[PDB]
Every structure is written in C-alpha cells, then in structure tokens.
Amino acid sequence: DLSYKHAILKESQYTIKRDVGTTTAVTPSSLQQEITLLCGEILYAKHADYKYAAEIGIQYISTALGSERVQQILRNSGSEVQVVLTRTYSQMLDIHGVEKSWVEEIDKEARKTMATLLKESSGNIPQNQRPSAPDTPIILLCVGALIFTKLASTIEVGLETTVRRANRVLSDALKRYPRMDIPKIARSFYDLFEQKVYHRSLFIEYGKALGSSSTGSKAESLFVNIFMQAYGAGQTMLRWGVIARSSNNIMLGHVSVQAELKQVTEVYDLVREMGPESGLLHLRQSPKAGLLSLANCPNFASVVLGNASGLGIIGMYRGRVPNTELFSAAESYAKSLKE
Amino acid sequence: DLSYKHAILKESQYTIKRDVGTTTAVTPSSLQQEITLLCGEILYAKHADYKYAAEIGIQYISTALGSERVQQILRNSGSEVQVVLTRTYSQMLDIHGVEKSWVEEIDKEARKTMATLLKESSGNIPQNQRPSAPDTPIILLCVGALIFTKLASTIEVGLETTVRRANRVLSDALKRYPRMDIPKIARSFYDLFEQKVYHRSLFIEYGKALGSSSTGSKAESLFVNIFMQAYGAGQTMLRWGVIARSSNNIMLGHVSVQAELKQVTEVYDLVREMGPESGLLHLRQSPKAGLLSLANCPNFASVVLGNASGLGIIGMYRGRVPNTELFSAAESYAKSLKE
Amino acid sequence: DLSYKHAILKESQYTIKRDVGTTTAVTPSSLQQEITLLCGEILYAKHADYKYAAEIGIQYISTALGSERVQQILRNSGSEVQVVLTRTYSQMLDIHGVEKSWVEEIDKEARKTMATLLKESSGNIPQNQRPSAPDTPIILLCVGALIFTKLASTIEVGLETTVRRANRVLSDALKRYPRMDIPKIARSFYDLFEQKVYHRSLFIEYGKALGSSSTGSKAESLFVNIFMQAYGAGQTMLRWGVIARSSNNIMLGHVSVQAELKQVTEVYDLVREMGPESGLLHLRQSPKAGLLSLANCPNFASVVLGNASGLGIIGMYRGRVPNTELFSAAESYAKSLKE
Amino acid sequence: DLSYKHAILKESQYTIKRDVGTTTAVTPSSLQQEITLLCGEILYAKHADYKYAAEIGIQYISTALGSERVQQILRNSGSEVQVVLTRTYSQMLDIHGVEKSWVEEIDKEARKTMATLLKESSGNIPQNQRPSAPDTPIILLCVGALIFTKLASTIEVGLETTVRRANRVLSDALKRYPRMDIPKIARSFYDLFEQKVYHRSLFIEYGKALGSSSTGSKAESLFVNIFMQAYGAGQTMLRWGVIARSSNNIMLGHVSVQAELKQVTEVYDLVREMGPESGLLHLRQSPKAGLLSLANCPNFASVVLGNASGLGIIGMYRGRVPNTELFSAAESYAKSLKE
RNA sequence: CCCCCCC
RNA sequence: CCCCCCC
RNA sequence: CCCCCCC
RNA sequence: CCCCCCC
RNA sequence: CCCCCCC
C-alpha cells in the first residue's frame, strides 16, 4: 500500500498553484555590500523591535544566490510569489514588505551605539567588532539555522534550544557583539519560516549552494554544520529505529514487532526510494511527509522508544508510547545492555 | 544519512560566487629572478616589519606556476578574485596590495646589513649566504609550510610549533642566515592564510606541482616533506581511530562502541569515497569538511582518546572526552599493553 | 489538403497593397560616419528617453545596405511605404519620424557624460570607450537581434530574456559602456518591430547581407550568431517533433499518434517545399505562417511535449497539452530513457 | 535549420562593399631582390621599433605573387582596398603606409651591426649569416605563420606560444641570426592581422601558392608546415568531437548526447558541404563562421571536453563545460580507457 | 486562429 | 554571440 | 615545420 | 492526521 | 557547529 500511495502522489500530471496574488522581496547581488551593513547593524546594538531580522537574512541569501535564481527557486517550490526587487534611497534600503521606519530605526540605533562605544572607549575598535564585518549576515543566518533545526518542534522548545545552543555554537560572535539578542532574532526567524513557507525552500537552496562551494569562511562552515544538523528533522523515529536495530534489542523479536516488521521495512524502502530529498520533507513541510510515519506500527514504535529510553537517548522526547509493556521491557533490556 | 548528506553536497548544479569585487596580485615568471632577491632579502636582515613576507612567498609561487595558471587556480577554488599583474620600477617590484614603502624598506635594510657584514668582515661571503641565492624563496616557503601544517590549530600553538620545529628542520638555513625571524615570518604566513583563503589553494597547487617534479633541490624536497606532513590536518581523530583498531583495544568491544561502529565505518567509507582530496578538506577550509567529524560517536571518540592517552600519543591534545569511564578504562588497557 | 492550401496561397496573380499613404525614413551611406556617432551616443550615457534607439539602428542598417536597396527591400516586402531620405543640419541628423528634440537630447546627454568622465578622470579614454567607435551601431543592433529572437514570444518574456542574455552575450560592450540600458533599448526595438512590420524584412535583409560578407568584426559575427539563433522562431513544435523522432519515443507508436503521422509528415513536406525561407515566416509575420502549425494533431503534439518534458527540454514552454495521458506517459518514458 | 541558414548565407545575389576609401601597399616582383634585403635587415640586428615587420613580410608576399594578382586577391576577399605600388629612392624602398624614417632606421641599424661584427671579428661571415640571404623573408614569414596559427586565440597566449615554438621550429635561423626578436616581430604580425583583415586572405593565398609549388627551400617547406598546422583554427571542438567518437566514449550513448547527436551530425554535414575552405573560415574571420559552432549542443560539448580531459588532450583549453556531471563521467571513463 | 522554453 | 590546448 | 636506419 | 530529545 | 598532540 505505501508504495502505491507514493506512486499516486509522485505521478501527478497537474501542478498546484498557490500564493497567486502575493509578492515577496529580494535584494540583487549589487546591493550585497549594503545588506551586509544592515545584517550587522542588527547584531551589535540593542533594538526594541527585532521584527524583520529574518527578512534581512533572507535578503542576504537573495544577494548571494541572485535575484533571478531566487525567483526560480520560489517558482519551483510550488509557490507563485512574484519577486519584488530592492531599491536604495537617501544611502539605505527600501525592501518590499519591510517598513522603512524599521530600517531607519535599526540604522540609527546602531549608529548611536557605535558613537557611544567610540566616544567613551579608547577608540580601538577591531575589524571584527564593526557592523560592516562581512560575516555578520552569516552570523544572523546562524541563529536562523539554529531555529531552522527546530521547525518540527514547538515554538517554546525551539526558542529555548536556540538560545541554549547559541551561547556555545555562536560564542565567538557573542564576544564580538556583546549585545545581540538571540531570543528575539530567533523569534523573528521562526515567524518568517511559519508565515512564508517558500523561504524554507530558499534557505535550503542557500544551504546547498554554500555546502557545494569550494571555499568558505568559518561562519559559512558553521552555518553548513547546523544546516546539516537539521537534516533528519521530523523523522527521529526512523533514526531511533535503525538505532534499535543496531542495538540488537531482544524485544524486536517479539511476536507483534515481527508482525509489523514487514511494513516497517516498507517505510524504510520508501525512504530509500525518495532518496536524498527525503530528509528535507518535514523541514519544507512537504505535504508528502507523513508517508514516512511509523505511527501505523504501534508496537515497533513502543519498542523503539523503549530502547531509546534505556540507552538514555530519549531525553525528553514527547512522542507517545502505545504499548507500555513493550516500552518497559525494551527499556529494561536496553539499560541492562548499557550497563 | 552521511552518504546522503555528501550526495546532496556533491551533486550541486550551481556554483558559488564570492570575492566578486576583489583583486589579488601575481608575479609573472619573467620576474622570478627578481622575486628571488626579494624573498632572500627578507631572510638575512633584521627587519622591523615582516608584514608581507607571506605575500612575497606567494609571489614566488606565482612565478613558478605562471600567472595564467595561478589565475585558473584561483578561479577553480570558488573565488572570483581578479588577478593583478606585477610591474617593475626604478630595479624593484611594485606588487599589488604590497606597499612600495615596505619593499623599499626591506631592500634598504638588506643592503645596509650586507654592507656592514662586508666592510667589517674579511669579504669571503659564500655563494649560499647572499640574498640572491636561488633557494631563499623556498626557505621562506618552508616557514610558510611549517605554519601551514598548523592551520587547524590555534595561532599561539601554531607559532610556538613553527619556531620549535624550524630550529631543527631549517637549521641549515639558519646557519646560512643567522638573522631570520621565524616568529614574525610565521605570523605573516598565518595572517595570509587566514585573510586570503584562496591562497591555501594556491599553496596546495604549488605543493602538488613541486611533488610531481622530476628533480628538485634539497629545499624543495624539504618543502614537500613538510607539505605532506600537513596532509591529515584537522582529522587526527580518524588517524587515532585507525590507530586504536590497530592496537586491538578491548574497550572497542564494549556495548556502546559496538553500537556506534556502524556509523563510524560510514564515516570511513565517506573518507574513501572522497578519496585523495579528503585530507586537504580542513587545510582548504572546504565547507564540506565536518562530514568527517566523529563527534556524533562520543563513546568511540572517548575510547580512541583513551587509547591514544595510554600509548602516549595524545600528547597535549585538546579534544573533549565525552565518556570519562571509557576514556580511563581504555587508557589503562593501552598502558598495560604498552608496558 | 495542406499542399492544396499552400498551392492556393502561393499561386496568386494579384499583389496586395498596404501602407499606401505612409512613409518611412532611411539614411544614405554618405551619412554612416555620422549615424555611427548617434548609435554610440545612445550607449555610453544614461538617457531618460530611449524611444527611437531602434529607429537609429535601422538607420545604420539603411546606411549599410544603401537607400535604394532599402527602398527596394521595403517594396518587395508587400508594403508601399515611401522612403524619405535623411538630411543634416547645424552637425546633427534630421531623421524623418524622429523628433529633432530627441536627437539633440541624446547628443547633449552624451557630451555632458563625456565631459564629466574626462574632467574627473585621468583622461585616458581608450579607443573603444568613445561614442564614435565603429562597432557601436552593431552593439545596438545586437540588443535588437536579441529582442528579435523573441518576437514570437510575449513582450515581458522577450524583455526578461533580452536582459538576461545580454548580460553575458554583450559583456564586453557592457564593460566598454558601463551605462547602457539594455531594458529600454530592448523595449524600443520591440516597439519598432511591432509597429513597422516591414522593418522585420529590412532587419532580415541586413542579417543576410552581413552573413554573406567575406569579412567582419566580432560585433558583426555576434550579430549574425544571434540572428541565426532566431531562425526557427514560432515553430518550436516542429523542432521538438524531430527531437522526439530522434529520441525514439515509444508513445510515438501509439494508435492515435500513428493515425496522425500522415498529416504530420505532410506538414514536414510543406516545410521542405517552402525551403530556406520557411524559418523566417513567423519572424516576418508572414500570413502564410500557420500552415506549419501542428495544432491539428493534438495527440502528436501531446507526445512531443511529453518527450520534451521528460528530457528537460520543455523548460517553461507555455503550449497546451491536449491529451494529458499521452503527455504523462511520454514524459515518464523520456525520463526513463534519460536516466 | 542549419542547412537553411547556410543556404541563405551562400545564396546571396548582392556583394558587400567595405574599405571603400582605403588603400594598401604592394611591392612589384621587380623589387623582390630589394625587399629581401629589408626582410633580412630586420632579423640580424637589434631594433628599437619592430612596428612594420609584418608589412615587410606582406610586401615580400606581394613580390612573390605579383602586384596584379595581389590586387585581385584583395578584391575577391570582399575588400575594396586600392593597391598602391612601391617605389625606390636614394637605394631604399618607399612603401605606402610605412614611414621612410622606419626603413632608414632599420637599414642603418643593420649596417652598423654588420660593421661592428665585421670589424671586431675575423671577417668570416658565411653566406647564410648576411642580411641579403634569400630565405630571410621566409624566416620572417615563419614567425608570421606561427602567430597566424594563434589568431583564434588571445594576444598573450599567441605571443607566448609563438616564442615557445619559435625557439625550436626556428632554431636554425636563430643560430644564423643570434639577435632576432621573435616577441616583437610576432606582436607586429598580430597587429597586422588584426588591423588589415584582407591580409589574412593574402597570407592564405601565399600559403596556397607555396604549397602548390613543385620545388621549395627548407624555409618554404617549414612555412607550409606551420600554415597547415593553422588549418583547423577556431574549430577544435569539432576535432575533439571526432576524437571522442574514435575513442568510443560510453557517455556518448547517454540520453541527452543521443538527443543532440542529430544536430551534431547536421553540423558535420555542413562542414562537408562547405568542403576544403571550411577550415579557413575562422582564420579569415569569415562572418559565415559560427555556423560550425557546437555551442547549441551543451551535453555533447561537455562529453567531448570530458573525453579530451581524460585523454590529456584538453591541456589548458579555456572552453566552458556546460554539464559538469557529464564532463566528470566522461573524464573518468577516458582516464580508465587510457590506463 | 496561431505563437509561447533554453542558447 | 563566437573563439580559447599541444604540435 | 618536416626529414633522419638498413638494402 | 503528522511532528515532538540531544549535538 | 567543527578543529585542537608530536614529526
């Protein structure tokens, strides 16, 4: 059945159309040196409103890939959003859907903070501490990638995890910019990813275009590391299933587990059939996701969760254990094997 | 998963573009006999500023490979830096991005030192002690290759190791040039490698074009020896893992180590899949590096570090030991086997 | 039937008469050295109005072919437009149908830009950067030829494609003239081609008189390359049909495809019967075009479009697929053969 | 389509007219014994200005073919240049477009060098070392033919290749004339070929009139060897395509390659249709060149370039690889077959 | 009615 | 637009 | 550039 | 319905 | 996030 369902979904002669009357903003590569400034003036000043930081990160992505490539990416993502270009005025940027009041506020706040830290201090600002640093857009996109790995999770868990992991992953940027509010920027990125779902596809295309590069700075290598940490998002049950098989859990040989193993292997075969893009299904909110669910094998899922709980892997996972006896037996065996 | 991640990174139909508006300097082979002089006038005099010694070494590399081949190397490294040629003036060199004041200072300092060592002494300067010696550019590039092997490490460790190893590796050059400041030249080379990342690719191409040569002087053989000592940079955990497997450590048979051995072998298979260029991934700061990390196998890494500590190989390695009990048990077994 | 229709259209003893009371402008060869200046003063300055750039390109064509040959070309194109010669005044040109205010504005804007770029800069303007360069009329006609290849398409697609292709085809001219507005010049050329349809015949005659030349500059070779890229305009279905036959698509052997293959071969026989001038039928808007339509073979057209979609050739083609089942089957087989 | 494009270009009832008000210089055969002297006084002396050496070689060509035949050659090349004859004065030559100051400078420099090498030396100048040697014009035309083979390439590559190949091809002349500056003479010939394009036709006519001769010296045989090495200039992709077909590359059987093979064979059929003069199309800058481009078959071109790269033939070819996956696969297969 | 991609 | 290696 | 042995 | 830990 | 010793 599962192969037939995927065959129906894949073999479609008709293309969906959505967001027909909508538009979005991009910034041409000719403005990259400008957007960098903006992407850094968000980082070293303490701003009251961090509402469009995610849009500025996506603007930098658009400068990197190019306006035409970004339009093509949005078009092939199933969304008929018409790209609107970015202009300059007196210079500053007039990004579509980003209020000019916001851009002026961010610029003025950063200029005032820079003046205050230059007047009082000894005037020895290093090359990495200024807003026009060239890795500041990647530093903002690193907060974006941290909150990207938690798009399958909830908002509160995502924000808490982003802040916790960014105090260590982004320690160097925090030292360079003492006053960068990872919570508010992470909230902005979560809002962008939820509202504009095609920007998940744009962000993934940037991740690919960055990982495929021949050279990169440490900021881009960090961004790619986090982006790849997001790969199996929304499918931790499959990873824990292969973990359970590697652990040689005895309760995998139970009668009901052996009964469901056929369709479990069917799900894994479907994973292989989709191939490399299967991992990005839940990150993209591809409607095709959910063909990879193991919820139709309650006993296998309970055994997998029990094995994970025994090994300590389960952590604070919020999934359901359908069959509690199998869960407890698997947990006991996994603890025994671990000890 | 790891094979799929590498498949995504490798199978990219789009090329990255960076350093679009930037330029760099090369020196044509027709100026090699001139750059040699410069590359040696850095070595036998005591200079206040050693800021661009690395750029002069890279200039000699550009003379060796050729301007067009160097432009091609920079282009295929993912960087759209426009090569700027080198000219002469009254003769001395006007290298782009190298201030003419610096070149004049180095030349004048070397001429004054030569006059002082000729007026006072008996006038018996041998053929190897003069700045126009033909192995002086390779002697400078040897300090560069020593600091090249420490690009994955930190700056202070790199400089300390460079000086310590250069007092023995480069003893003959030090005898020939009593006043050559390995610390400042090493600092210059570290600065060049950090700022201009495409010059890592140029330096690797010189290493290949030198190792592939049919003949070479002892300086070039030394440079190739050091360059090959840099091969596995940034991946000492994989080397220590194969060391642990060769040592037949009993704690490799632990439950958790045997649990993680599958994905460990996956990392090694990915190493084989990339092939010869895998070793140069961290040296080049290829963003694709980090697919070879064993950080997702904490128990295997702890066992490997314990085995290394028992054998005395660990030295002063600064990696983390995740599971301390496995580390201590492996260290005890490794010491027992060593004794 | 199709041969009979073409026989009726071809065997006509009566000549049509149109544009009887209309006139058009030409420029004699004696003014070529003057028109060149104008054709280049459009290219290196930033003009508010680019309305008659196409007429200036056509004026240069008229200088190249000659006034009498141009009148003959207009007469044999089915249009009874009376040629009006070009005069000079105080020197500048008074082209018929081109307001003297426009010519004065273009000349003054170019002179002011030249004065600004000479006063501020170091006064080292090369021979190719000045308006009086002899390939500037061909550079303008290259934008005209780019928008010529998109006369069967729509206006927006034509302009987008012209700009995209001119950033690469005309990179050297863009470097020579940093401020040349390919969008506005392309709009002017599209307007000319739509309003004055006999100028399509003039432009084709220039393409022939240029391709037949024994020698030419790189600009003229580029113009001929683009002009020949326009050859099969308006008939991509025939090209994709021969592509499908070359691909040996199995769905070509379907019952309905084999039913329609007879009249399909009739269309191809008509193509051969018309011969070399068949390709220029849609470019010229020859009313005889439409005898080459494959719209009366819906199943063959659907199979051809499916084959193109499978091979990736279809791109973003906007034609209709009549029979969706054949389209999908052909697409599946074409993808299978491609893989 | 390609056959129709060539049919349009070939079937033209109108002849182009260019260079109407221009003139050029020829030298009658009655002055050959004089021009020989000049053509050799360029070779054994060290001249500050080598500006018109190419014009002197072309003058010798004009003496060889004859003034009337040279005028006819210029006329049938599509250029309406009026031949101006050459006169003598007190003897020396007054060549049109060649300043008499230049001729006097060359003659005086050669006479002074001859006096210096006769006064100091033992006075045993052999018959081949004097300027009046009868193969000196052919020795100059050999540098001209070396730079002729690189007219499709760039200026810097052409000059570098000319010098590199002339140190070996023209070793005997270099021994006879120690001070002959192949770089400056090659620059002069490149300038002539770029400025006066009809002189490419004259130079080709000399190549034909020399190859058709019943007897010749070793200089003329060398000139014909180089001239024939120039035959396929500007079309190395076709030669590499037939090389790939000879290599039986498996990736030629790919789906897209087999898709494009039809129009590829169309290009080759057009090559056969034009016949012997097809090779000289790019050398002559015939505007008809570009009908032979394989740029409209990106997958075939990528496979051909990959095969060449595998066999080591690609060298340092600067063409584009459109489809990188096909290029890499073809390169791998070609290396495997080579090994 | 016809046309509609890429180069 | 085209061209781009070696001999 | 080409040629290059033996009979 | 699906998802849900850690890095 | 990754890296981190010695030669």
From Swiss-Prot, chains A, B, C, D:
Functional summary from the UniProt entry: Encapsidates the viral RNA genome by forming a left-handed helical nucleocapsid that protects the RNA from nucleases. RNA replication depends on the availability of soluble nucleoprotein. The encapsidated genomic RNA is termed the NC and serves as template for transcription and replication.
Disulfide bonds: none
Keywords: Capsid protein, Helical capsid protein, Host cytoplasm, Ribonucleoprotein, RNA-binding, Viral nucleoprotein, Virion
Superkingdom: Viruses
GO cellular component: helical viral capsid; host cell cytoplasm; ribonucleoprotein complex; viral nucleocapsid
Family listed: Belongs to the paramyxoviruses nucleocapsid family.
Compartments where located: Virion; Host cytoplasm
Signal peptide, first to last residue: none
Matches recorded under InterPro entries: Pneumo_ncap
Protein name: Nucleoprotein
Subunit comment: Homomultimerizes to form the nucleocapsid. Binds to viral genomic RNA. Interacts with the phosphoprotein P. When in a monomeric RNA-free form, interacts with the phosphoprotein (via N-terminus). Interacts with protein M2-1; this interaction allows the association of nucleocapsid with the matrix protein.
Main location: virion
GO molecular function list: RNA binding
Transmembrane segments: none
